[PDB]
Design a protein around this ligand. Structure first.
Ligand SMILES: [Cl-]
Ligand SMILES: [Cl-]
Ligand SMILES: [Cl-]
Ligand SMILES: [Cl-]
Ligand SMILES: [Cl-]
Ligand SMILES: [Cl-]
Ligand SMILES: [Cl-]
Ligand SMILES: [K+]
Ligand SMILES: [K+]
Ligand SMILES: [K+]
Ligand SMILES: [K+]
Lengths: 248, 216, 238, 233, 230, 213, 201, 238, 196
């Protein structure tokens, strides 16, 4: 029996967990996914990995999930493990609502799922979830928020971050451009297209290849929308027109 | 059992010189109705101990198979050890109290006769776990009718021969048939001795109804 | 070897090595001798000290009024089997009011010791016992092993250098049946003496004796209570 | 790779034999059974002068009449010590009396080889305890000292030493022991042998000393009292 | 007496790839070819049912299976594993109907069935399924076609092929398939994609085909298959 | 329905002296208006130093005595010594209370010697409340035995009596007298009186006949 | 039963009766209703005798375990709270105990009342039992924090003795305790009837 | 359930799984705690925040109760569990007993939790060490620290994480009454010991202080930089 | 039988509870507090079964405190009241239900002053004023009579005075002392206890 045991929840001589760091490699081969925080909102921008002439397009999104009335997340890694975690995120958000009769604070929902993912790294003898998640939302305590989740079960709050393919190149690109305290949603949408264009593989960038959703506070209500193809088309072409005005 | 269905009345027991004798009528009553007038309420445990039982007959038949299996299991080992009349009495006491404490009792009153090591054994077991030893035993109505007879004879003559014990028992079955409404005139006699257990066939006590003419 | 890490792995020869490795634990323990007459059953064991400052280990243990044991192997496995034997004897007296026949108690050991030898993750009991008892069939000397197998014997010795004691008893096995109790213990002591090296002999500190029979209940003599048995000794010859 | 309940070709459990080796890394502890009491001594092994002196507790109280010295993995020990303290008070509740030093040691020895993987509880032990213990106390059989190791084997001792320098302290006790020793000489001997087998010099804050004698209860020695016994070097 | 393994048989390799899932993907890629086409007013599903011998009773077992009144299934890979997923999907369809009193949306069935497939990539003592499912359905007056795979991931298709020559089958469909087909035209291009990877001559016994529309899902009778084979 | 209890009668008495302890009881076992047996003593040997007397529901009495017997062995295998009179009394309290919500219909009185050799008597209720005292009666005729002992042994309600220490001879006669008086009035008391005397030498039993009606 | 406890300038005093009853018959008249947990912990018993003994002794066991683990002893507040939780575990099961917890700790003299229901209170004065009403009567009239030990002992005796006079289920002897900064001292064990005759003159 | 022994003894007598968890803490961020006369102060470092990240979320100083706070080093994911388990125990001790939790009890619980994870089936030990800071009800300041093995000690001043060997040695040289005299110099002692190992700059220091009776105070990046101004004023000068 | 009362104003919540700890026919305490501090601005007043009240009240108290430690901020008066409601409602159809009647008073930084009424059946209702106990039958009419949603703190204590005087005159039970506390922007303030 122990002959076939892979020993998933065990320590390495250096003091690290192998299955966790091997799961990190799975994220690197998945789609590029970025999140940017602004003054009047917060958004997610992700690379669509499911692209074909023969795909039907039935759902509103591919990688962007609505979890709460005031919260949404994006995913990078194994999609089936992502579906399990996002469904659990929707459950925990509803359990809090049932108990307190008010929406779950952003940080608390991230904390809850991270405790589940951490449990998979310590006991059970099972493989961890090979998924990294980006959470965006609004609560009455800290306002607009952005969070990053690791397969290790570790989290952090960011003003701008990225996970997936060419993630280290995307974050250093954001580190230079991001203007702390001055960022508006219109500036953050323009930055998202700029980072994706340089980061992505197919070069030219298309409305079928990217996926963007915005979270804003309007009339005392949190409005979450996945941007239409006609909107994305204008966002790509506005960067395309500024690419033509860069030479003299 | 919460409510007993088919019941058996008094079971007798008295020990003579060189053994013990037990009697019980072959009646299974459904309330007041005499349902089965030819059913055995006595069993042979092994060659040293025997058992007669009052109360619920279904519970008696259940205890009959459990004790029956225990003797079978012991005979398979063949290690020169067998259950003594005291050991059966001790087991039965523990069995009845255990069922009683679970509020699901075996509705039975037992008389256990036995002969081992030149000594005669007679033990009483209740459905609540009440157990003791006596020279003479009578359950149900026998405790009010037959037991006073047995005690008065045993006071004048403590030691009895097998013949003396038999005719005393037959005298008691006569009184039981006269005075118990839940009795019948068809009974068995079981006997333990140096030779073993011997259960005799359908017996009837001699009845006299001459007092039916003494009312004028 | 790779057929020797689990009890659930059979060797190509048709053996289980983990049972045989557990049998090695019995041989490493100090020697103990058991023998019987027509009336008595006597256990004689050799107490052992790791250092001269530390006291000697317990070898003889109580089970019931009519049954006693001597241990050889692991201490915790000995105490675990001892507590099972005590519990079975208690259950027998609680239910039947009569002492549990020795033959049946050893059979319960055989049934219990077998279970862990066939289940993965479990291990055999690293202790061998010599059981001395008295019942309706008279005195009994029984032997248990890490392998669930058990033996009914006239006399037996297990532990370190127990072969020397085994040969002594084999010569005098016809002597035991008509032996007086005092003569019976001396036979057990003389067998245990053969196990020791030539430099050292039986002392009042390293000898433990247990006796059960028709006369009395199981009794353990250790220090001052042992010297009457040792006194009146035929000298160590070669 | 093997299981935790695997026998060696020699006839021993690997995990137990390895737990004995874990003791050989722990600090040295010495107990001496005198006819008029039992004394326990241990080195604290200070790693830094920043660490609090009375913080390390390698000699603890189990009952009013029983003391226990520990060596090896301290974390494993305090789990066994708490169980020993529970046992004494469970026995006090049920029988209205103090337990014998032998029965307490036997109670701890029952947890010995209660470890395994399969056919076990969710909270069952995975491995043995890397601890050797010295139970020293006074009951109705006079002053007593007991030694216990991971194998479960427990035995009475007139004088015993366990730790890193076990053999060195054992031979020093071997030639300096009389079964008629006084309690004054008992503490003296344990202090004399302790400085010989240590890497550090004997200070009043460096070691723990305890006494259990027929008259008074188990006593933890205060710094001032240690200076009166170290005055006689 | 037995007690199962509690450790995962699918783990992350140093490359970051769950090897057992890709190995399970090799099982479907080597299985008999299957094709599904969404065609405006309905859905068609077709598979190779070549038993490779005349001894077999071609009528006994089926590869195109109904889940409910409006949903059907086809597979590429192992038959025994597929059966388990059919029985599980049939129960999930009834569990939904008992609670909501409404025919289960195809997207909701695939999500529930793909979640079962996910379990066998993480649970102890089990291997993943060696089957890729093709789920068709009709709800809200709209045709649906979905693919579920060993990974537990699901995709929505206009037209796709799986099994033997799945790469050549897809490229064929890229050129051949056009949106706004009629259902009867979809059966033709389904059999045509199946002919590209066949090897042998096609009879009504050699292939199995089911259709889904507003009237529900049903498997085409051997007589109906013969008429399209001309 | 079904009642798990039966009243079997019986009265138990214990008195403590300087170096002795007395446990006494009737030999009558009864049920309703009938007598089960005339030969049923309620006194029972536990150790050479301690004797128990059980009365009430005989089914409970038989099971409880067997539990104590087993627990006495369990103690001596674990502690290497016999269980003391005070320890048995402390143990019985916990065993009786473990059945707080389904109690033993039982009246226990323990009689023996303490560790100093002095006489000790422990009186219990069906649930497990106990204490040490000089003398106590328990059972169907306990209300008949008590007041005479309060007057004679306790010297209560008397003015100028010199308070003579209790002897074995006087206590033996006191034990006999109260039971003879109880057999005259209590219907459940009679047949024979068994007296168990606990001394440093051991247990000695004595039987005096009573009313058999 | 009758039980009282009150505190003043010089500490806490505890007084109880000694009578045990089954229906209308007297089982015992020597009954000890005070449990000496520790040199500075004290508990009184009212309600069901078996329920009081077992649980308060179990509290005593836990007080002992507390002293061994931390080596500092236990606060009165903590001790009373522990007992409360045990009764809370066994709710609706018909356990009957009324008790008071006396001690001296860092906060100072401590008095608590604990209930079978799980009621827990702290106060200057408490009385529990069938005759507590009578005890309260004499206690309230003639009580001041400004009392001398002799006067406090008078009040304790007085309260219990009068309670026993009026009450059927209270009688025997008065057992009085004094709680001092150092620890508790057992003042006396005086016969109630003799006291009552003395008071009659 | 998963029943495999994760942490086992090695031939030399080592618990590798515990030792690897101690390698995880040595890779962790630098954390130092020091007991003063009137106050106790923690200080954590190796922050290295990308300045694109909200640092309010990644704070390594956590309050367990009103009078107890802690700092950790190692696997930050593991810490969150232990912290929340200690926080639940804080309120449980408040429910079972009226009294608030003593600093030693919380440390003992965290230590017992870490110990249980080294001897239980199916689970690996925690990869964290903790520095526990608090006050007793009598007012005496207390500082403790735990490690993956389950051992705990009281400290005057201690450091855990990377550069712990360097910071610890600094505290041995700099721990006298001259540095503890005032409340300000004790906080300065933290910053000086901290800025001694870290990639220099006050921007990377988050430290917390708590007085004898006052609630926990997490200091402003303004207040700490004012003390960094007082250390460089007396660096080129002194 | 005990008494609770709450009066909510435009920017404050006034609450009062009796100080009697009664057993059968005796008053064991004159100064028993029936108020529980949940947060810096939340008070829970509990009434009902003897042992059930304190155990339940403290359990919620410790969980609201647990939330504060785990998050760095306190629960809102609404979230707190809904939490207590959830715990009581889940024990309703169990073997052991809690017979507790409670009153939650709080101040939110956004919503403002809040007062919540709750049954032993666990039915939650927000009220401008509420009272628990048999005394409510005598006082709710006085509250109905003189209450305006714009009542000042000076008038609120005077309105409470009118209610407590009614309990002295008409109510058969002896309730001489009352705990009075006000919750607002600054938190909980202990006010002079009303004695008769
Ligand atoms: Cl929501
Ligand atoms: Cl039973
Ligand atoms: Cl051995
Ligand atoms: Cl060792
Ligand atoms: Cl497993
Ligand atoms: Cl028991
Ligand atoms: Cl008294
Ligand atoms: K081989
Ligand atoms: K070993
Ligand atoms: K104590
Ligand atoms: K508190």
């Amino acid at each position: 029996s122990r002959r076939y045991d892979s020993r998933t929840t065990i320590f390495s001589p250096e003091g690290r967990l192998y299955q966790v760091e091997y799961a990190m490699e799975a994220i690197g081969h998945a789609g590029t996914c970025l999140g940017i925080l602004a003054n009047d909102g917060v958004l997610l921008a992700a690379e669509r990995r499911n692209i074909h002439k023969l795909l039907d397009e039935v759902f509103f999104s591919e990688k962007i999930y609505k979890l709460n009335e005031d919260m949404a997340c994006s995913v990078a890694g194994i999609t089936s493990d992502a579906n399990v975690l996002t469904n659990e995120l929707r459950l925990i958000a509803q359990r809090y609502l049932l108990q307190y009769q008010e929406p779950i604070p952003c940080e608390q929902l991230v904390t809850a799922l991270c405790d589940i993912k951490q449990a998979y790294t310590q006991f059970g003898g099972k493989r961890p979830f090979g998924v990294s998640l980006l959470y965006i939302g609004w609560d009455k305590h800290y306002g607009f928020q952005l969070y990053q989740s690791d397969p290790s079960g570790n989290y952090g709050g960011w003003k701008a971050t990225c996970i997936g393919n060419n993630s280290a190149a995307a974050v250093s690109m954001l580190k230079q451009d991001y203007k702390e305290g001055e960022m508006t949603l219109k500036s953050a949408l323009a930055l998202a297209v700029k980072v994706l264009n340089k980061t992505m593989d197919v070069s030219k960038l298309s409305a079928e290849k990217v996926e963007i959703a915005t979270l804003t506070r309007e009339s005392g209500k949190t409005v979450i929308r996945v941007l239409k193809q006609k909107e994305v088309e204008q966002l790509i072409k506005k960067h395309e027109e500024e690419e033509a005005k860069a030479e003299r | 059992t919460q409510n007993p269905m088919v019941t058996g009345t008094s079971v007798l027991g008295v020990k003579f010189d060189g053994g013990v004798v037990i009697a019980a009528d072959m009646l299974g009553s459904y309330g007041s109705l005499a349902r089965f007038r030819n059913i055995s309420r006595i069993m042979r445990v092994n060659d040293s101990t025997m058992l007669g039982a009052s109360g619920d007959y279904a519970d008696f038949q259940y205890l009959k198979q459990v004790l029956g299996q225990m003797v079978i299991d012991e005979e398979l080992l063949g290690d020169g050890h067998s259950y003594s009349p005291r050991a059966i009495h001790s087991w039965l006491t523990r069995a009845m109290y255990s069922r009683r404490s679970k509020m699901n009792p075996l509705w039975n009153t037992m008389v256990i006769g036995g002969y081992a090591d030149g000594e005669s054994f007679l033990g009483y077991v209740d459905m609540l776990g009440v157990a003791y030893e006596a020279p003479s035993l009578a359950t149900g109505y026998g405790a009010y009718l037959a037991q006073p007879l047995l005690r008065e004879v045993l006071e004048k003559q403590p030691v009895l021969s097998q013949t003396e014990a038999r005719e005393l028992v037959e005298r008691c079955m006569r009184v039981l048939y006269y005075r118990d409404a839940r009795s019948y005139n068809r009974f068995q006699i079981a006997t333990v001795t140096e030779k073993g257990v011997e259960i005799e066939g359908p017996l009837s006590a001699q009845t006299n109804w001459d007092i039916a003419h003494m009312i004028s | 070897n790779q057929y020797d890490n689990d009890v659930t792995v059979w060797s190509p020869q048709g053996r289980i090595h983990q049972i045989e490795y557990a049998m090695e634990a019995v041989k490493q323990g100090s020697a103990t001798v058991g023998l019987k007459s027509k009336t008595h059953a006597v256990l004689v064991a050799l107490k052992r000290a790791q250092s001269e400052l530390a006291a000697h280990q317990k070898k003889i243990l109580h089970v019931d009024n009519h049954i006693g044991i001597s241990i050889a192997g692991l201490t915790a496995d000995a105490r675990l089997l001892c507590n099972f034997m005590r519990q079975e004897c208690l259950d027998s007296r609680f239910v039947f009011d009569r002492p549990l026949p020795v033959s049946r108690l050893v059979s319960l050991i055989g049934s219990k010791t077998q279970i862990p030898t066939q289940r993965y993750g479990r291990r055999p009991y690293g202790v061998g016992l010599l059981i001395a008892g008295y019942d309706d069939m008279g005195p009994h000397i029984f032997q248990t092993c890490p392998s669930a197998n058990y033996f009914d014997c006239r006399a037996m010795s297990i532990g370190a250098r127990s072969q020397s004691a085994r040969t002594y008893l084999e010569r005098h096995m016809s002597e035991f049946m008509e032996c007086n109790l005092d003569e019976l213990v001396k036979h057990g002591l003389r067998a245990l003496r053969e196990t020791l090296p030539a430099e050292q002999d039986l002392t009042t500190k390293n000898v433990s004796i247990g006796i059960v029979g028709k006369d009395l209940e199981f009794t353990i003599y250790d220090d001052d209570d042992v010297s009457p048995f040792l006194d009146g000794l035929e000298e160590r010859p070669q | 790779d093997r299981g935790v309940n695997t026998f060696s070709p020699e006839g021993r459990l690997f995990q137990v034999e390895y737990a004995i080796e874990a003791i050989k890394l722990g600090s040295t502890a010495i107990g001496i059974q005198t006819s008029e009491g039992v004394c326990l001594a241990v080195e604290k092994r200070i790693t830094s002068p920043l660490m609090e002196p009375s913080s390390i507790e390698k000699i603890v109280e189990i009952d009013a009449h029983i003391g226990c010295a520990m060596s090896g993995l301290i974390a494993d020990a305090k789990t066994l010590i708490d169980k020993a303290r529970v046992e004494t008070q469970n026995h006090w509740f049920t029988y209205n009396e103090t337990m014998t030093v032998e029965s307490v040691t036997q109670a701890v020895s029952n947890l010995a080889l209660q470890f395994g993987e399969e056919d076990a509880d969710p909270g069952a032990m995975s491995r043995p305890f890397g601890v050797a213990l010295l139970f020293g106390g006074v009951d109705e059989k006079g002053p007593q000292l007991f030694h216990m190791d991971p194998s479960g084997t427990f035995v009475q001792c007139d004088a015993r030493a366990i730790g890193s320098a076990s053999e060195g302290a054992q031979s020093s006790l071997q030639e300096v022991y009389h079964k008629s020793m006084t309690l004054k000489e008992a503490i003296k001997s344990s202090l004399i042998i302790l400085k010989q087998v240590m890497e550090e010099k004997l200070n009043a804050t460096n070691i723990e000393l305890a006494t259990v004698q027929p008259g008074q209860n188990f006593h933890m020695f205060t710094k001032e009292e240690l200076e009166e016994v170290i005055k006689d070097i | 007496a037995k007690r199962g393994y509690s450790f995962s048989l699918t783990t992350f390799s140093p490359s970051g790839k769950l090897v057992q899932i890709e190995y399970a993907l090799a099982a479907v890629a080597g299985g008999a070819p299957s094709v599904g086409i969404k065609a405006a007013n309905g859905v068609v599903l077709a598979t190779e049912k070549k038993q490779k011998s005349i001894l077999y009773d071609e009528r006994s077992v089926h590869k195109v299976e109904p889940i409910t009144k409006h949903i059907g299934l086809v597979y590429s890979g192992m038959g025994p594993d597929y059966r388990v997923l059919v029985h599980r999907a049939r129960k999930l369809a009834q569990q939904y109907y008992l609670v909501y009193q409404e025919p289960i949306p195809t997207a909701q069935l695939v999500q529930r069935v793909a979640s079962v497939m996910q379990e066998y990539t993480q649970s102890g003592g089990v291997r993943p399924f060696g089957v890729s499912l093709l789920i068709c359905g009709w709800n809200e007056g709209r045709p649906y076609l979905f693919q579920s795979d060993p990974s537990g991931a699901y995709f929505a298709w206009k037209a796709t092929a799986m099994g033997k020559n799945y790469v050549n089958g897809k490229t064929f469909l890229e050129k051949r398939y056009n949106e706004d087909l009629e259902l009867e035209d979809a059966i033709h291009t389904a059999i045509l994609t199946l002919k590209e990877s066949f090897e042998g001559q096609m009879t009504e016994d050699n292939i199995e085909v089911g259709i889904c529309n507003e009237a529900g899902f049903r498997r085409l009778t051997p007589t109906e298959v013969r008429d399209y084979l001309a | 329905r079904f009642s798990p209890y039966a009243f079997n009668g019986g009265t138990v008495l214990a008195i403590a002296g300087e170096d002795f302890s007395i446990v006494a009881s009737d030999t009558r076992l009864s049920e309703g208006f009938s007598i089960h047996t005339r030969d049923s003593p309620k006194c029972y040997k536990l150790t050479d130093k301690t004797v128990i007397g059980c009365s009430g529901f005989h089914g409970d009495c038989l099971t409880l005595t067997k539990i104590i017997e087993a627990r006495l062995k369990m103690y001596k295998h674990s502690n290497n010594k016999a269980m003391t009179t005070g320890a048995i009394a402390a143990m019985l309290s916990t065993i009786l209370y473990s059945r707080r919500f389904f109690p033993y219909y039982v009246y226990n009185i323990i009689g023996g010697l303490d560790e100093e050799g002095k006489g000790a008597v422990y009186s219990f209720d069906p649930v497990g409340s106990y204490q040490r005292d000089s003398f106590k009666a328990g059972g169907s005729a306990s209300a008949m035995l008590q007041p005479l002992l309060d007057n004679q042994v306790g010297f209560k309600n008397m003015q100028n009596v010199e308070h003579v220490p209790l002897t074995l001879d006087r206590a033996m006669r006191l034990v006999k007298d109260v039971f003879i008086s109880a057999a005259e009035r209590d219907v459940y008391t009679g047949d024979a009186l068994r007296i168990c005397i606990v001394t440093k030498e051991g247990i000695r039993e004595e039987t005096v006949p009573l009313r058999k009606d | 039963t009758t039980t009282l406890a009150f505190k003043f300038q010089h500490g806490v005093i505890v007084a109880v009766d000694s009578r045990a009853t089954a229906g209308s018959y007297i089982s015992s008249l020597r009954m000890n209703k005070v449990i000496e947990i520790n040199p500075y912990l004290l508990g009184t018993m009212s309600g069901c005798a078996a329920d009081c003994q077992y649980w308060e002794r179990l509290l005593a066991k836990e007080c002992r375990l507390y002293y061994l683990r931390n080596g500092e002893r236990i606060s009165v507040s903590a001790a009373s709270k522990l007992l409360s939780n045990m009764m809370l575990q066994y709710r609706g099961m018909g356990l009957s105990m009324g008790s008071m917890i006396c001690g001296w700790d860092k906060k100072g003299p401590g008095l608590y009342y604990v209930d079978d229901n799980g009621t827990r209170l702290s106060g200057q004065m408490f009385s529990t039992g069938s005759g507590n009403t009578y005890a309260y009567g004499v206690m309230d009239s003639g009580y001041r924090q400004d009392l001398s030990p002799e006067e406090a002992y008078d009040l304790g005796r007085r309260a219990i003795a009068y309670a026993t006079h009026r009450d059927n289920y209270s009688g025997g002897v008065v057992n009085m305790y004094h709680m001092k900064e150092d620890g508790w001292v057992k003042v006396e064990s005086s016969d109630v009837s003799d006291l009552l005759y003395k008071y009659g003159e | 359930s998963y029943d495999r022994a994760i942490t086992v003894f090695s031939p030399d007598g080592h618990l590798f799984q515990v030792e690897y968890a101690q390698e995880a803490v040595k890779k962790g961020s630098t954390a130092v705690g020091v007991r003063g006369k009137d106050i106790v102060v923690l200080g954590v470092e190796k922050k290295s925040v990308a300045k694109l990240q909200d640092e309010r979320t990644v704070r390594k100083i956590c309050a367990l109760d009103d009078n107890v706070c802690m700092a950790f080093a190692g696997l930050t994911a593991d810490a969150r569990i232990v912290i929340n388990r200690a926080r639940v125990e804080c309120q449980s001790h408040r429910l079972t007993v009226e009294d608030p939790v003593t600093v030693e009890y919380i440390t003992r619980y965290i230590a017992s939790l870490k110990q249980r994870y080294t001897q239980s089936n199916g689970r690996r030990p925690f990869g964290i060490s903790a520095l526990i800071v608090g006050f007793d009800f009598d007012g005496t300041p207390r500082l403790y620290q735990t490690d993956p093995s389950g051992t705990y000690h009281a400290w005057k001043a201690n450091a855990i994480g990377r550069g712990a060997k360097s910071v610890r040695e600094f505290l041995e040289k700099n721990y006298t009454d001259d540095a503890i005299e005032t409340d300000d110099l004790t906080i300065k002692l933290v910053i000086k010991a901290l800025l001694e190992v870290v990639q220099s700059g006050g921007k990377n220091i988050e430290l917390a202080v708590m007085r004898r009776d006052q609630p926990l105070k997490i200091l402003n990046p303004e207040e700490i930089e004012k003390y960094v101004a007082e250390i460089e004023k007396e660096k080129e000068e002194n | 039988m005990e008494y609770l009362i709450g009066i909510q104003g435009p920017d404050y919540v006034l609450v009062a509870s009796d100080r009697v700890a009664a057993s059968n026919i005796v008053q064991m305490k004159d100064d028993h507090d029936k108020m529980f501090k949940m947060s810096e601005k939340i008070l829970l007043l509990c009434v009902g079964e003897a042992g059930d009240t304190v155990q339940f009240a403290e359990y919620i108290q410790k969980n609201v405190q647990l939330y504060k430690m785990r998050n760095g901020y306190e629960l809102s008066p609404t979230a707190a009241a809904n939490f207590t409601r959830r715990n009581l409602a889940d024990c309703l159809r169990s073997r052991t239900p809690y017979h507790v009647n409670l009153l939650l008073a709080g101040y939110d930084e956004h919503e403002g002053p809040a007062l919540y009424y709750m049954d032993y059946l666990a039915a939650l209702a927000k009220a401008p004023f509420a009272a628990h106990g048999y005394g409510a039958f005598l006082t709710l009419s006085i509250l109905d009579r003189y209450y305006t949603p714009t009542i000042s703190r000076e008038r609120a204590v005077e309105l409470l005075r009118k209610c407590l005087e009614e309990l002295q005159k008409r109510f058969i039970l002896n309730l001489p002392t009352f705990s009075v506390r006000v919750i607002d922007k600054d938190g909980i303030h202990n006010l002079e206890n009303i004695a008769f």
